[PDB]
Amino acid sequence: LSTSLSALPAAARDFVEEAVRLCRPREVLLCDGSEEEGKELLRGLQDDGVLHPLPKYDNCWLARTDPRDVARVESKTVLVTPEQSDAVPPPPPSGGPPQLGNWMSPNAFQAAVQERFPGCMAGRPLYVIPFSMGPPTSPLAKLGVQVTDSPYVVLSMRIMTRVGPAVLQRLDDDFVRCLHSVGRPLPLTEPLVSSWPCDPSRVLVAHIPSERRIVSFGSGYGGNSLLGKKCFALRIASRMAQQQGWLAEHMLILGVTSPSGEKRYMAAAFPSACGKTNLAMMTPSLPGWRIHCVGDDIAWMKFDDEGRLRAINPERGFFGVAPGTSSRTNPNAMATIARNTIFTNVGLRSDGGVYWDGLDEPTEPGVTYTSWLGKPWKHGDPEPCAHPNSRFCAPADQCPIMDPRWDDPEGVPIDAIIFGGRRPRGVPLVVEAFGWRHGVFMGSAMRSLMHDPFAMRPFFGYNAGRYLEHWLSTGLRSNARLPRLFHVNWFLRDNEGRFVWPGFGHNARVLAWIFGRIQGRDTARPTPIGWVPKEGDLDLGGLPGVDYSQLFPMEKGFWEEECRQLREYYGENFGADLPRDVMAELEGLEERVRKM
Template sequence: MACARIDTEHTHTTNAFSTCKSMDSAQGVASLTRPQFMRSGVGVVDVELRVEKGGARQRVRLRGNKMACRSLTQIKDEDFAVVSEIVTHKQNHIPVIKGDFVSLPKHVQRFIAEKAEVMNPASIYICDGSQQECDELIAGALKRGMLVPLKAYEHNYLCRTDPRDVARVESKTWMITPEKYDSVCHTPEGVKPMMGQWMSPEQFGKELDDRFPGCMAGRTMFVIPYSMGPVGGPLSKIGIELTDSDYVVLCMRIMTRMGEPVLKELAKTNGEFVRCVHSVGVPRPEKVQVVNNWPCNPEKTMIAHRPAEREIWSFGSGYGGNSLLGKKCFALRIAMNIGYDEGWMAEHMLIMGVTGPDGHERFVAAAFPSACGKTNLAMLQPTIPGWRVRVIGDDIAWMKFGADGRLYAINPEAGFFGVAPGTSHKTNPMAMESFQKNSIFTNVAETANGEYFWEGLENEIKDPKVAMTNWLGQPWHIGDEGKAAHPNSRFTAPAGQCPIIHPDWEKPEGVPIEAIIFGGRRPEGVPLVFESRSWVHGIFVGACVKSEATAAAEHTGKQVMHDPMAMRPFMGYNFGRYMRHWMKLGQPPHKVPKIFHVNWFRQSADHKFLWPGYGDNIRVIDWILRRCAGETDIAEETPIGFVPKKGTINLDGLPHVDWDELMSIPKAYWLEDMVETKQFFENQVGSDLPPEIAKELEAQTERIKALH
């Protein structure tokens, strides 16, 4: 571990499981050789350290129990106190090249020490989040060729990944719990769960030890202290990520509150933190070809979560969703477990403030699957006069009922990690303004003029004939075959740069939510908007969310997939228990928001969108907020919920809208949908389905059957 004060006159046997490499004695400094590990009994390991002092050799023996999994070996409190009595600037003979290891809280020191011993980095770099640090890391990444400057902007950079490492990898993402059905539902034999994958702790230990020992050899281990939510806020949580990727450091600096303030908060409270371990999985000297200066190990990629231990392990991928562990891994999968224990919710939702012509602002949360328009809606530019939208967050919401009974939400993130293709001044001008400086672009194209480019910018580029380099690093022009940018290419931009960021976006206690909206890409059958009949029916509506697959994960094609609550890829525990958690939180004295479902993507028979979308979606939000305000005469009851009466949504200024087709509820389609939904619940939720949700399904099916 670290340097320790010892008595070199005797041979010691302690309970420490240490690999200390240099020791300070009362008489002077003693150097020692690499420790030798010897098995001296079942499950017991001795560590022999040969100490040289004044030409004489003496032995110090440190004795301890070796865990079955080396990667999870922990240092006990009493042992850590021994080995860290005196700490130098070196940790395990691994130089701490930046930061003060001694000043870190002891439990943080121990976390770093344990993992450094396993992963064997060449150096340790404790991040402080400063601009100087950012400049230093960017300079190194530019020199290596991992980043390319986009010279048309101020401090914007392009990164091209290995083409094999471009998206979240759901098939290699795991939950680790002793009891399988804490993580996944009781699915019938032979049915693969869609909402999460479970791995036993025993198998997990083997998988870890097949990957992590020595994985950072020759690389720097960066220590990233970060806060999800404003530092010190009542809903905020702290994480520490260890990574060997400077790309991760630079993106985490944008996406979280990172660095010295977090360490100060930890020192002040001596509080717990979520432990995050990430490695690209390519130790040096590299035995594989590194493409685009982007080391990765797709064959051994694994993203694993230990919810009870508040721990995340990620190996082999540098892509954001797999490596920025504060994002989906912490902010959803781990946070929803914390929320279950503490009585709050972690959801895949945007948060927006909407002000109408009356000057009254109300807040809305909305859950859509990835790449279905959360960012566009969060930054909506209303097309009708008198309306204003301001963004709190575009992807994740942590929500807790307050003392007044209302539901309050914070955005735990500090940046936007948005899908680039399709983003333009037409579709989302506020997002475009957010990343004009201090941003990182991943797998987009670069023009010869030093500008970014992706599909959707064809009508905005200054010179349509300009030469480009596509995301694969190949020459490209508009009109050439293939894509300029990868479909899941991303921008990473500071939220504070958004022109319509809400002044209360970092309010520690959050903002009160009046409506929760679910939605997805549904080309047919599902009306533009409907309101649930009750809180429990709203949970059922959320559980029925489906959407065409997107580029944000490894799925391809146009199949419509179930994505309950837009949380299918991010479930951190049994989905049946998750629905029961929602139902429990809906009990008095809690004042629950109304729940709605929207579908911007319904198409006509000739595959044209029936609704213009984008800024015109404010017309639907207007109706939703009027319903929240208690207007009863603007809705009519249908078998699936309450829909707008004809004429109650403002269509002024729009070209012809086929209202009847847009709002129709085809009986045959919905009966088939209910049969398919029942099958989905039976196969994917099984005996964990709450009886209340089963009753909602049965009742809705009967109402649809009664349709004329």
């Protein structure tokens, strides 16, 4: 932290001074990303009452939030574009609520800003965070400058992005301007809840792609305040990607190594698994196979000159949902969060550790708990000890299975893209698309039952129909080595209501089959919905009692209903903005189903 701003290049300096004149902070501090700066931030936050130390651990801390500020606020998150159709398709003609993004006119946006930001930082320091999304020397990296009046945001941004000398050295006119305030100018007129400043009634999270800008007011929480997280890495980046010939996606990236030493990378989009345990940190249950994590949330991907789709993880840390995390379910996540981690809204134990539903850390008898609301808590309370959206924020380099190339500036070559869903019947364990357009249709048809095309529903940066068009056009690149496209479902239930598939490390068996399909192996049989493994070409050895036929249902009634639902979904939500190729894939599926 320094009051000297001389190191900022002219455009970044102009942005900072604009924000200073608007917000009227007490002082202005440039962030340098150093260990000493982190200690200073922590000291101030503890003195402020925001952070509680967690002396059970090495350098871990706990924040609690006002209960009104605990998650992204979708209804207050908007895309600002001169033309509404650049942002979103027509509103559902039958009157249903829009589900593919919210639009705000420039006029309305500017008026909203003028009600909120003038003087909003009175009495507070403004912090300047120059940051890189991706290794700063990557040709795929993009830079930002975030100004904020929240030290909690600064600490978390330092974990989640690259903040440091390397960033300032590269900064020029081309960066995303990110303006953030918690919206609680001093002096306060009433006490805070849990020392957590916010202005819930006036929260606004706005994206203005034509101005390379994000503006966020009133929330200190996660996706609303850590402007790299979602606002930049998905919403602004997706529109940049459409304009510049790349892809910005809500996908984990993993490396899979076969027993005999070949390595392939895969990306996967899962809805409602955002922040949760996934494939990316999996300990495989097939001997000899290895899995490494490149990223577990965002993938930025671009074809190289050889036609290979290269991906980077544009983040530097994990911002994961805490409840359900345990040594049993995710030992790699547990290792990651054991030190130098900031926890938000988890329980606090009498021995100086943390608590959430599912945690299996051994504790001595008589250890007691305080909930995220700061109240005594015991098992059986109607309310959970940790808020369901409570978080850890930890550096990625602490994850024991990080891929050697996880921060390689060149990116990793992607050979498969996997879409995920959670369905108790009908949708098989794994299916491969017949080709690119068919695969784009599969991604468009994802569910979470809510539809969540490409796991991007809350995160589109521009018209979702044009996003689908952009995916289709991407497949036309000459000499592209297009990844194969798959859809998976870990969650089928048997004629007794329990899971057919054991999941967890056994999911490596599905990745192994995918791996073979990448290599061109003749290990599939055709069905109305795509290729599936031949019985015996999915490794079920060591899984006695697992019934292949219940993993690969082919139910005509299910698919007839699925097509009816998709037809209604596309009609209402995309209308004429749906690409013809997607409708053609639905029509194709309908006809194959008719004959089945």
